[PDB]
């Protein structure tokens, strides 16, 4: 609705998601993906990654703790997923603020991500230009024929033309690490599913904010994490 | 035998050198602490060589393998062997991924005390009920204990075969429950007793914990309750 | 004495210090969540160029050598150099120094680069200063003092009781609970909060000691669950609690 509908697609198709994400959020990413019914796989050697990105239903690239070696493996994965027809998702963590990852993400955009999930500043850096980032998101989306999700208190999602917004959640989500990085992994899995991509991405945003509102009622960030996983399951 | 293994882990507090994948490291350390053991994670090739000779047991889990890590793991296994310390292999996604499979095949030459893997993994390592014949032949060939883990775990020394049932399917909806089992299997090879029986007891300890923790119903609440159940 | 602790609590939330965390593989997530729960902002940046860049920006820098590697050591050095040039305080957590060679040598290299604070257990501070050997930390108190003077640092040598010294003065903190030792990362997370604390206004020594006390009080509250599993979420909650 389409949140309940997305819940059902995830459980029914159980997408296998190649996660190349950052060291702070890996465990939580895997647990989130398992809780919604998907299957996480973390593969990071350049050769293994190339091999696996062709096999997995979808690929997540998150640059939060980028290093030289991991960039090479990530570029390889992206190239083989693209050659295999597998959708890949970019999370441009702190792009705009740190040079190496900024340059790297500009290079990766050539290779046609199915979705880009970031905050206002990240999306502006990449567009070459959440709500004040909206013209940029639309520009970026049109340029790449991709879906862009610019996230915050309200999430905005666009394909260049249509814009959906998704309100809800709770401030507590920001005092716990890896909820946005986990949203990116759910968005990435959602690209592998049938239906309208824009609408599935807005649904993934809704799913995570609904779980977060439930888990936030506990009141503390420690208790939030178990409650959040429980509420996704 | 489960309660006896529980007691022995606490009384010996085995120092376990964990060379495990990035996703399960924290959980592995916290499981080992909860059962009364002592986890240490050492990954520099030189530090790992030094430390492997000192630790009571070594775990090698190839889940997020890289070439650098591979040379550090090779060096750790070689120094453990010469120090007479038992090491355990967890061949994650062997069969699935080429580089990994080649590396694990190379490590078999170095005589692990125990191998812990799923059906597919053990089938691949050896060249399910399907995996039982293969496990028995692997165990025979290397004189190791092989544990094929699943809804029911099977453990073999190549002659006898023990089954361990119980647990809860929810354990599969939480990452690193298998990886953590391998660490407790690694610790248990440092303990006195029959190695086959100690490994089977380790499987039972983790299933018993899991049955208690899954009662809450959800995979988020499972983790604190699992750790609490082990302590 | 508990006054500074309560004050440190409000100051961390008010200043929300941005801490560049170069810490070990096993404790990343928990360090980040602890720094978030106390009202700070963690950032894990590890590429050598990026780390140089970010260390100049951050309010403080934490160096924890727990899973040291050769490549990471290069980035940690770059970071420390740029934090020093920018006048941002940096903190050293010498995990397992003495007991492992490579990182012991590396730590001694870094000691010349003038850390604001050092945080270790008895054996690590002993080995770090170069002094042979219910209250494990007391015995390294002589080693702390000497290191604090030689480098004009603050040294926190932690245990069931924590001792914090600038070489002349010594403050002691107690409480907590031994269950804290049956959970991984509580040490390394304390170092992060110490790193945050060095960036706040006021007396540096007293702020480090206050950090040790904040964590001891949270742990006491979290521990009366009995179990190490329930401890973690209760610990974070307690730190968040106003």
């Amino acid at each position: 609705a389409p949140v309940a509908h997305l819940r059902h697609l995830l459980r029914a198709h159980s997408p296998l998601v190649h996660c190349m994400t950052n060291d702070v959020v890996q465990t939580f990413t895997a647990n989130v993906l398992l809780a919604v019914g998907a299957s996480p796989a973390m593969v990071i050697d350049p050769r293994e990654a190339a091999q696996f990105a062709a096999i997995a239903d979808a690929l997540l690239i998150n640059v939060g703790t980028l290093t030289e070696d991991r960039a090479v493996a990530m570029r390889a994965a992206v190239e083989h997923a693209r050659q295999a027809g597998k959708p890949w998702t970019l999370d441009p963590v702190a792009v705009g603020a740190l040079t190496v990852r900024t340059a790297f993400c500009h290079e990766l955009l050539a290779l046609q991500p199915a979705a880009i999930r970031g905050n206002a500043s990240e999306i502006l850096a990449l567009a070459g230009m959440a709500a004040a980032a909206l013209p940029a998101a639309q520009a970026l989306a049109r340029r790449l024929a991709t879906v862009v999700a610019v996230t915050g208190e309200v999430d905005y999602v666009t394909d260049g033309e249509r814009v959906l917004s998704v309100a809800g959640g709770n401030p507590l989500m920001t005092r716990v690490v890896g909820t946005g990085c986990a949203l990116s992994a759910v968005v990435a899995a959602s690209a592998a599913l049938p239906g309208d991509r824009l609408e599935n991405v807005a649904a993934a945003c809704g799913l995570m904010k609904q779980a977060g509102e439930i888990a936030a009622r506990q009141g503390g960030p420690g208790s939030f994490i178990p409650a959040f996983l429980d509420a996704l399951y």
Side-chain angles (χ1 to χ4, degrees), chain A residues 1-212 214-233:
Chain A
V3 170
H5 181 51
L6 180 68
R7 256 180 227 121
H8 170 80
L9 298 171
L10 291 162
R11 296 192 230 101
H13 291 81
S14 202
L16 175 62
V17 187
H18 180 182
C19 298
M20 310 188 72
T21 187
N22 73 64
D23 307 319
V24 192
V25 310
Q26 273 187 44
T27 307
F28 188 63
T29 297
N31 279 334
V32 164
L33 276 171
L34 288 167
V36 304
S39 196
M42 285 58 182
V43 182
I44 61 178
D45 173 270
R47 300 187 290 265
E48 293 192 327
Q51 187 192 358
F52 194 70
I55 275 159
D57 302 309
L59 171 70
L60 176 69
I61 303 301
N62 174 311
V63 297
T65 54
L66 192 67
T67 58
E68 185 226 299
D69 286 348
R70 187 69 38 91
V72 169
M74 285 173 164
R75 190 150 209 312
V78 170
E79 294 283 16
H80 291 65
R82 184 177 183 255
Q83 289 219 343
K86 313 303 188 184
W88 76 272
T89 294
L90 179 69
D91 186 338
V93 181
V95 165
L98 297 166
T99 287
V100 172
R101 60 183 70 179
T102 297
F104 179 65
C105 285
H106 283 128
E107 297 168 47
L108 279 195
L109 303 186
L111 313 170
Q112 303 171 285
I116 304 179
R117 202 294 299 164
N119 71 23
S121 60
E122 298 162 359
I123 294 301
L124 281 160
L126 293 175
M129 289 178 178
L134 255 180
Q138 301 179 77
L140 190 52
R142 281 197 289 275
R143 202 227 299 169
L144 309 178
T146 192
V147 175
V148 179
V150 46
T151 55
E153 198 193 353
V154 181
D155 297 331
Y156 301 93
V157 188
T158 175
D159 73 349
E161 286 181 29
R162 300 194 285 158
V163 178
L164 308 174
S165 66
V166 176
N170 184 289
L172 200 63
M173 296 188 68
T174 57
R175 305 311 302 168
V176 146
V177 81
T179 50
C181 295
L183 170 59
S184 302
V186 178
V187 167
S190 83
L193 303 169
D196 190 71
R197 196 156 276 171
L198 171 51
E199 289 182 28
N200 286 334
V201 170
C205 289
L207 172 51
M208 295 302 274
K209 271 170 158 66
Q210 285 195 17
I214 294 168
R217 302 167 184 168
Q218 319 263 302
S223 294
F224 179 90
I225 290 155
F228 183 81
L229 295 162
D230 286 346
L232 294 169
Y233 185 69

